[PDB]
Amino acid sequence: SGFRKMAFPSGKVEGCMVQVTCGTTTLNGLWLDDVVYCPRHVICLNPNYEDLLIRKSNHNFLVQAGNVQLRVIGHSMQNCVLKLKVDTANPKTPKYKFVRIQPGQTFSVLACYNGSPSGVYQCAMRHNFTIKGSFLNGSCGSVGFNIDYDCVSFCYMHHMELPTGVHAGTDLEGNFYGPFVDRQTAQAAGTDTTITVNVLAWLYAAVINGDRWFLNRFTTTLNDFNLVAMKYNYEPLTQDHVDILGPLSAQTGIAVLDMCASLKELLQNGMNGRTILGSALLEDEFTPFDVVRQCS
Amino acid sequence: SGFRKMAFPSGKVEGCMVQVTCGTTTLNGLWLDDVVYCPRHVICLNPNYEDLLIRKSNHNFLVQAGNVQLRVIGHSMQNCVLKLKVDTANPKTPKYKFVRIQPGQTFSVLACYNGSPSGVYQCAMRHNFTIKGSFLNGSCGSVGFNIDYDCVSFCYMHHMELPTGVHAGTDLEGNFYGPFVDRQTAQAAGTDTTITVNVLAWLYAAVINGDRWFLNRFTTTLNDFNLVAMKYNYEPLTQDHVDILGPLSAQTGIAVLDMCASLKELLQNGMNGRTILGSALLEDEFTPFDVVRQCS
């Protein structure tokens, strides 16, 4: 029993983190086989990165894995990421993939500074392609990931903090999530919504853990729910979402549209001083998979 | 910017986790140098553990580190923990200490099953010596820890889930936190309180991150605050707590007793629909050290 924001064990990723210094700028890089991946900002209001890279030499890049220095033998740019070819393959390279994630999906972040891991936490990709992280100066190049069996699926490399204090970055091919750029500029994200399917998954987690006070005998229709959903800035619920919640509905014996009637009531009336899984708010950063993984 | 429940990177602990099987019972163990530490329950309503251990042989203990089997060459009991001497020193043994923590202090938990890490999260030791964890059957032997520099301070080994769904365990010398025993019985914890000094630390984290709506021009006395604190089941605030919050008070320019007047107002009036660091409740599982570590 119990339900926590739970990150993946970070050890496989810790063994890949290095420090990359170019001139006066230091940030983090990801060392997989004989390539180090890092934000291209390490070579700097609006840079001409192609010009800046042509003017670099391999010896300008100082790459340190712990104490050991790795020598750069080649460099190339891929969108907003640099690929530094090094003379040594990382012996701790796990099985891995570069996967781009969808809004509403979660991942673990290993916050890293000067190439040294600092902490681990869970994030969700918001529908406006930001994440609500915890990052200080020098965190550029920290990565987000999921683990399946022994395989690390890297999905995020950190680049930017927005004026609102949320964070923006790229996938590991260097393509930004959302309408952001890697420049020293103030950038605004689009409007965000609440991830409805995750709220429902978390209500199922609560029932599995013994929180039932919000249940009711009523069932609603998908469309009557969405009418109420649009009013409170919730993502419209779809049949595929209903299908994805099937396993949790089966385990608890509570049909999805039955749970939707509970959510509608919570949106209209609040919690009236009560809490769900220790929260006084409706939590939307647990996916259905996250609940099944942790509750089973 | 941003403030998250942040665990320590778990890699140093992952390399120490093994599986211990005795008869039909399997749980997790902690492999440091040539000793495996695990809950003594692995040898089982009220066992006579001294009798049960005398009847065991080294060859009854199946210890597996990944695929590799470790052979037990000796065994002894230390309070509620077994020490299994093995023929191989763990080559990944980090610098480490066994430290017992105080109520109100936090640590990271690496939830482990069949010797394999599953996830990482932060916990606080409550004043009733329970933790609000996330643990399923087979999680016995999972450990909690803090990291300072390169040194792992192990503080918790998991044994028990209470009927209320909170968790109980021992330090790594096998001595339980709180009035609990390692038996298949329903056990109740004492009454709990809210960790006042941590709530204040978290209010400082909020100010550092730009949440100021709860501030006010008023200052209170320590005793007038505690009169209100006792009414809402908060731990009495002491001068040492005030001293510990000094660095955060200095960074924000908000005196501790000034912040106490804000907390008193929040206790009496609530938040009136607003949130602090994404929460609609007063959060008490961040220590002053946790805030400084993450905000700096």
Residue numbers in the entry:
A (entry chain A), B (entry chain A): 1 to 44, 50 to 301
List passages from the publication reporting this PDB structure.
The asymmetric unit has a single monomer, which forms a dimer as a known biologically active form along the crystallographic 2-fold axis. The crystal structure reveals that the catalytic C145 nucleophilically attacked the α-carbon of the warhead in 20a, forming a covalent bond of 1.88 Å. The residues of the oxyanion hole, i.e., the amide backbone of G143 and the amide backbone of S144, interact with the carbonyl group of the halo acetyl moiety by a hydrogen bond to help position the compound. The S1 pocket is occupied by the six-membered lactam unit of 20a, which mimics the Glu residue. Here, the lactam’s NH forms an H-bond with the Oε1 side chain of E166 and the main chain of F140, and its C­(O) interacts with Nε2 of H163.
The main protease (Mpro, also known as nsp5 or 3CLpro) is necessary to digest nsps at over 11 distinct sites during viral replication. Additionally, its high conservation within the Coronaviridae family makes it an attractive therapeutic target for developing broad-spectrum agents.
